[PDB]
Design a protein around this ligand. Structure first.
Ligand SMILES: [Mn+2]
Ligand SMILES: [Mn+2]
Ligand SMILES: [Mn+2]
Ligand SMILES: [Mn+2]
Ligand SMILES: [Mn+2]
Ligand SMILES: [Mn+2]
Lengths: 304, 304, 304, 299, 299, 299
C-alpha cells in the first residue's frame, strides 16, 4: 500500500556530520488521509518557484546525500520523499489507523535521521502521529503547537489536538485564527491553559502590532487551510468567511519564535472543492504552495 | 402568491412576557425582489453552523413559543419564517409594489409581536418597507441607518434610502464603504446631513483605529453585498473592486452602537452571478451566511 | 496590421492651447503583446462606470477636439484610441519587435500632441517603448518608475525594466510589492540604487503608515497584475500568493507624488487564465478596470 | 476699573472692506480675573517669536488700520484690561468689563482672544457673541483636566444651563466626579478623556467633525503639570504641549467665535535659573497656534 | 521604633462579612526607609482629590469599621509608620516593622499599600503574603528604570533567589548591565524596556496576560526625570505619567497582593514657586489609580 | 588659548591595527563656545552611569592605548578644551581650536564627539573631515527646533552654501520662517517637523534611509523645554527625551563622521533642590547613545 514510500524513506542517508549544530535539513512528503485519491498539492508545490519571500532559495532533492551548504549562500535543502500513497498499488483506500501508522513510521524515520518532517495535504491527523513520534524519540523535549484553524478543533475527544492534550503530551498550544467557537471549545480552552488568538482579536487589536509568538520550546506548526478566508482557500470542507489573507498568515508565521521546528503539517485541501481558473488551476493550490515554502523557511531560520 | 408565508406569520405567537425588558427575539425571512426565482441564501444560511464569532450560539425555530433563555446561557433564539415567495404558487413573478406590500405586512406583523425582523436576499427595497413599517408602529422613535454599499444609492429619487430621506423619515444615515460617488450623490450628501465613511477614508485612516459608530438611536442595518470586494462577494450586478473583506465588514459591524436594532436587511446577492467552487457552492453565499449570523448577534447584543 | 490604429492616431488633434499649463489630457489605447488575441480588458474597461474613488468623473471621447473643462467641474477627458491590433487584418500575429515599434509610434505621437499615454493589457513590454519614447522627446527630463509587480523583473537582461536601467535611462525606480526575489535580483537591486518595498515590508511595517512615495521627477506607472493577490487577479501566468488587495494597490497608488505622469502601463492580464463568475465575467477584469480608472486620475491630479 | 483699555477698544477702526469673506482679523487682550495683579503672560507672548508651527507668520499691531494681506497673520494688540491705581476688580467688574470689550471687538469684525484669567472670560465672550448673533449656533471645544460643570457657578455649566450651546467637547479630563457625569449626561456633551486619547493612540485623531462656529477654551491644567505647573489644583497624567498642539490642529468649523486661554498663575510656576517660567513658555506657544486656527479654520 | 503605628494596626477590625467575595478592602500606610525623616508624600496624597481617572471615587477612613458599599472605594488610613523621638530605624527595624504591619493587615482582609521608602517594603510585604499563603503563587509587576537585580541585596533579587516568585515583569528599564542580563536569563523574567515600549507604540498595549495574584512595585525613577525628578540616580528617557497610568490599567490578575510606591526623595524634587514638588503631584496621581486597580483587577 | 588640551590630543596614540575594519574608536572632548566658562556637562556625563539603553557598556579612558575588545565600548576622554587663565576665546579661536583638534583625532582613527557649545563645533568638525576626505560624501542629521539656516552666519547654512554636503535632514523643527523655507527649497533638504512626527505617529519611524557617512548635530532646544529648559530661545511642543532617543536609533549609514551636542546653558537650567539640572540629566543620556550609534551604525 504505502510500502514503496516507506522503503526508500528507510534507505535515506542520515544528515551529515557537516551539519554541525545547525538547523535542518527538511524532509518533505505527501499525506492524503481523509482526502480524495488525487492529491495534486505535493506535485503542484514542487513545480512552484524556489525563491522565498525572505531572501533565500529552496533546493529540492529526490535523493541524498544532502550536503550542507555554506552558512551564507542561503540555499535551503529539501528532501522530496514523494507521495505516501502509491497510486498504483491497486485501488485500495487505506484506513484511519492505516494512515496513522504509515505517517508515524515516516516521521520516526526522518526524525532519527535528523530531518525536519513536513507533511503536505491530508485532514490534519498527521499532526497527531508526527507529534507523538517526536515525543517518542525525545521524551524530555517540550513541544508547543502553533495551530492555524478556523475551528479550535478540540471538542471531539478523538480530534488530534484534543488527544495530544488529553494524553498530557504538550507543553502548550496556541490557537491562531479561530472564528467558530462552541461551548465545548470554551470549556476545553479553559481546562487546558490554551493561549489563543481569535479572528476579531487579531484584526481589531493591531494587525501589524502583533508582538510575535514568544515560544521557548520546539515548535510544531499545523495549518488547517480554512484558517484562510474562503476567498483565498475555498478548497475546504468547512469554510468560514472572515479569515486570513495568505499575506495575513505569512506574516504571523514569520513571528513564530523557538529553538527548533519539530515538524510541519499543512492540510485541509480538497481539490474537489477548490475554485479553479480557466486553465484548471485551483486558488487553494496557489495559496498553500506559497505557505508550504515559507513554512520550510521557518524550519531553517527559527530563533528566539 | 405570498399568502402561505403571511398566514403563518400572522399565526406567530407574540414574544413572551418572560422577555422582560431585554433585547430580541429575532424573526428571519427570505425576500427575493429583483432577484432570480431560485434564492438559495436563506436555505443556505440555515444549514450553516450556529456558533458565532463572539462566544454565543444561534438557535433556529420554525415555530413558537420562543422561550427566553436565561440571561447567561448565550443562546440566540431565531424564528424561521421561511421564504416569502411560495415556489409552488404557479410561475407568477410578483411586482415591485407586490413585493413592497408583502414585505411591509411581514415587518408590521413581526414588529407588533415584538420580534426584530431580518430580511435576507433581495435588491434592498426591503430596507424601505421595513423602516416605514417601524415608524408606523413607533412614530416617536428616531431611526438611524448604517448602510453598507459601494454605491451611496441616493441619486435616483426612487431609491429606498433617498425616499426615506425625502419623506423626512430618518434621524440620520451613515454610509459605509462607498467607492463610486457621483455628482448627484455629493449634492444629496450635502443637502442631507449624511455622515459617511468612503473606502479610501476607512483604509487609509486607521483600519483598526475605527472609533466605532456612535449612535444614540434605534438602528436599521442594511448591507448591499457589493460593499465587499468582488473577490469576496462576486454575486453582484454592479461590482466595484477595492472593497471590504468579510472580516473588514464583520469588524465595522461590531462597532455599531445603539439601544435597539429596528431591523436588518442583507441583500444584493444574485446566484446567477456568483463564483462557484467545484462542488457548486458560491463564494458570496459563504460570505453572506457569516454576515447574517453576526447581524443577528448585534440585534441581541447592541448597546451604547 | 496595426495601420488602422496608427492612422487615426496620427490624425489626432494636438491638445488645445486652452489647456494652459495644466495636467492632461489622457490618451488611452489597447496593447496585446504576449497575450491571446481576444483582449477584452480595454473594451471591458470602457463599459465600466465613470465615477472614481476620489470625487471626480471620467469622460471618454473617441474623437477630438478634447476641450478643456473648467478647472473645477471635475471631469476627466480621456481619448479612446481603441485596440492597437486590428482584429480583422487577417490572422497575422505580430512579432515582439512588431509590437515594440507599433507601441513606440503611438506613444511618440500622443506625447508630441501633448497627451498622457495609458497602455492597457499586454505583457509589460509597452513600459519599455513608452519610456524610451518619452526620453526621445524629452532627453532633459528625468524619469522615475513606480513598478508594481510580484517579480522584480530585472534578472533577464532583456526585461524591459533591466534594459532601461542598463541603457542608463532612469533617474530611479521604485519596486512595490515584490515577493519572489532571486539571487540575481538582489545583485541588480544592489548595483542599481533601486528603492524597493517588498510585501513583508509593506504589510508588517505600517499598511496605513505608508509615508507616500516622494518623487521629484516625472513618473511612469507600470502595474503587473500579479502584484495583486491571486484571489484578486488570478488571470496571471505567474501567480504568487500573499499579494495586494485591489484596495491595497489603490491606496499606494494615491500616494505617488510628482510633477507629471509620463505614461501608464497596466498589464499581465490573460483571459484564458482568469476566474469567471457564472455570467462569464472575470475577476481580474473587474479588478484592473478599477485600477486603470484611478491611474488616469493620478495623471490628472498628481502633485508633490 | 479698566477705563483706558475700553477707550482704545471703542476707538478701534472696524475691519476693512478688503477683508470681506476672509477669516479674521484677530483682537487680542489681557484678562486677569482670579489671578495676581502681576500678569506677565500677555507681555511674554508678545516678546515671543512670530513664526508658527504651520508655515505662516504673525504680525502684531497696537493700533489700526489692520489691512488685509494676500501668508501673514495680522493681530491687533489691545493691551492689558487692568491698568496700573491699586483697584482690584470684582467678579462682576471683570465680567461686565470683558463682556463690553468683547461686544465691541466682535462688531468691529475682529476675533476676540482673551489671555490669562480663571476661565470666566469664556462666559462673557460667548454671551457677547450670542447677544449679537442669536441666529448663530455655538459649540465650545474645552480643554481641561476637570469637566468643570459640577459647580453651578462654573462658566461652562452656566452657558449650558441657559440653553446657549449647540454642543460642548471636553478634551483631556482626568478628574471626573459623580456630579460631573450627571451633568455630562443631561446636557449631552461629547468628551475625550485622557485614558481614552492615549489608548486610542494620539496620532490617529485626524480631526473633530464640526459644522458650527467654535469657541476654544483652554484651562492650562489640561497639560501635564510637568509642562504647565503654574496652575491651581494640578492633575498629573495630562497632555504634552505637542499633544495639545496636535488636537488643536484637528478642530474643524466655519469660524472661531473667540478663544480663552487661562489657568496661569505665575506664583505657582516652575522657573529656570534666569527666572523664566515653564508655563509661560508652553502657553506662549499654544496661544500663537490658536490665532493661526482663527485664520485657517475650515471643514 | 514605630510603636503607636502597630498599635492602631493590631486594633484594626477585620473586614466585614458583607465583603465576602469582593475585592478589597485597602490598607494604606506611610513607609520611610532610606528616605529623610520629612516624608510629605502620605499627607500630600491624602490632601489630593478623591475622583479617579476611571469613573469612581475614593473614601478615606482613619478608623473602622470599613463597610462595603454597592461605585465608591473604601480606603483605610493607617498613618505614618514612624512617629515623631528622633529615632532613625535600621534596615532590620524597617523590615520587621513593615513585615509585622503587613502580616496583620492581610489577616484583617485588607490589601496593603506601602507609600514612600526605598523599595525594601516590597521584600517584607511579599514575604508576609507568602508566609500566610504558601499555596498562592505570586507574580510581581515591577516598574523601574533599573532591573534592580544586580545587587544580591536588592529586594527583588532576594525574592527571586529564595524561589518565592512564579514570575516577574520588569517594565520601563533603560539602564541594563551585563550582570542584570545574567540574572534576567536564569530567573526567566519577562521585561518591557523603554526602547521596546515606544517602538512598539504605547497605545497597542491592551494589557498584560496574568492568572496569578499580583504585587505592584513602582520605583519612581521609571518616570522620566521631567515628571519625577525627586529620585536618587535618575535616568532620562522614561515614562510620562500617562504612560505609566496606561500600562498600569493593563495589569491583569485575580487579586492584588499589595502595592509599593517608592523612590521619592523630597530633597531632590523640583519645586514650584509655592514650594510644591513635581514628583509629589505625579506620584499622588499614580497611587490613587493603584488603589482603583486593587478594587477592579480581573482577567 | 586652549594650549594643554591640544598637547594631549597631538600626543594621542593612533588606533591599533587590531581595530582594522571595525567601527570606532571614539574621541570625546568639551567645547564651550557661546556658553559661560562654567561648563559642567562633560564632567556630569563622565560621572553618569556606563550602561546604555541597548545592551552594551561604555569604557572611558583619559589616555591610550585604546585596545579593541571582542560588547564593551571604548571612549577616549580628551577633557575640556579651555583650561582654567581668564582667557575667553573668540569665535575664530574656538573655530581654529576645534578644527585643529578634530583634524588630529580623525587622523588618529577616532570618531570626534564635541560636547557643549553653541553648535559652531558642527562647522569645524565637518570641515575637518572633508579636508581630510574630499572623496567622502557627507550627510548631516540635524536635531533642532529651528531650521537654523536663515542667518548666513549659521554653521549649517555655511556648510550647505560651500557645496559641502550631499544632503541634510532637519528633525523636530517647530519654528520655520519664510527665509528658512527659501533656503530649504534651493538646497533640497529633507526635514521632519514636529507636527509631522506626531501626526505620523512616532513609533512607525523604523529608520532613516542613508548610504553616506553621517554627522549628528543636536541642538538641545529640539527637546521640549520641559525636558531641556537650559536653552537660549526655547520653543514649546518638542521631543521627549525618549522621542529623540528613538529617532536617533533609526539613523542609518556606513560610519559616523562626528557628533555635536550643544545648546546647553547651565544659567538657564531648571534645578532640583540638590542643584542638579534637568537638562544635564537629559543630555547626559543622549550623549551616551550617540556614542553607541558611532559603534553600531549600519544600513
Ligand atoms: Mn478547520
Ligand atoms: Mn450597491
Ligand atoms: Mn510579475
Ligand atoms: Mn481645570
Ligand atoms: Mn530605579
Ligand atoms: Mn535651536
Amino acid at each position: 500500500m504505502f510500502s514503496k514510500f516507506l522503503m526508500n524513506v528507510k534507505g535515506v542517508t542520515p544528515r551529515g556530520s557537516d551539519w554541525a549544530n545547525r538547523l535542518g535539513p527538511v524532509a518533505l512528503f505527501g499525506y492524503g488521509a481523509g482526502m480524495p485519491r488525487r492529491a495534486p498539492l505535493l506535485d503542484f508545490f514542487l513545480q512552484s518557484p524556489r525563491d522565498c519571500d525572505h531572501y533565500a532559495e529552496l533546493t529540492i532533492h529526490d535523493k541524498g546525500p544532502i550536503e550542507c551548504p555554506p552558512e551564507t549562500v542561503m540555499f535551503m535543502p529539501v528532501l522530496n520523499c514523494g507521495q505516501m500513497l502509491d497510486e498504483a498499488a491497486g485501488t485500495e483506500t487505506p484506513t484511519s489507523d492505516e494512515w496513522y501508522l504509515g505517517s508515524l513510521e515516516a516521521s520516526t524515520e526522518l526524525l532519527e535521521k535528523g530531518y525536519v518532517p513536513v507533511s503536505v495535504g491530508g485532514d490534519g491527523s498527521a499532526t497527531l502521529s508526527m507529534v507523538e513520534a517526536y515525543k517518542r524519540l525525545f521524551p524530555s523535549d517540550d513541544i508547543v503547537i502553533v495551530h492555524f484553524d478556523a475551528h479550535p478543533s478540540v471538542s471531539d475527544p478523538r480530534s488530534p489536538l484534543r488527544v495530544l492534550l488529553d494524553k498530557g503530551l504538550l507543553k502548550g498550544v496556541v490557537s491562531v485564527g479561530n472564528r467558530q467557537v462552541s461551548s465545548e471549545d470554551r470549556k476545553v480552552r479553559k481546562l487546558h491553559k490554551m493561549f489563543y488568538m481569535d479572528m476579531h482579536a487579531i484584526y481589531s487589536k493591531g494587525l501589524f502590532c502583533i508582538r510575535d509568538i514568544r515560544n521557548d520550546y520546539p515548535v510544531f506548526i499545523s495549518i488547517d487551510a480554512d484558517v484562510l478566508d474562503p476567498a483565498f482557500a475555498p478548497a475546504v470542507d468547512s469554510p468560514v468567511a472572515g479569515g486570513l489573507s495568505t499575506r495575513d498568515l505569512l506574516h504571523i508565521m514569520n513571528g513564530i519564535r523557538g529553538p527548533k521546528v519539530v515538524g510541519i503539517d499543512v492540510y485541509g485541501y480538497n481539490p474537489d472543492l477548490d475554485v479553479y481558473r480557466k486553465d484548471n488551476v485551483g486558488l487553494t493550490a496557489i495559496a498553500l504552495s506559497k505557505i508550504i515554502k515559507e513554512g520550510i523557511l521557518k524550519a531553517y531560520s527559527i530563533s528566539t
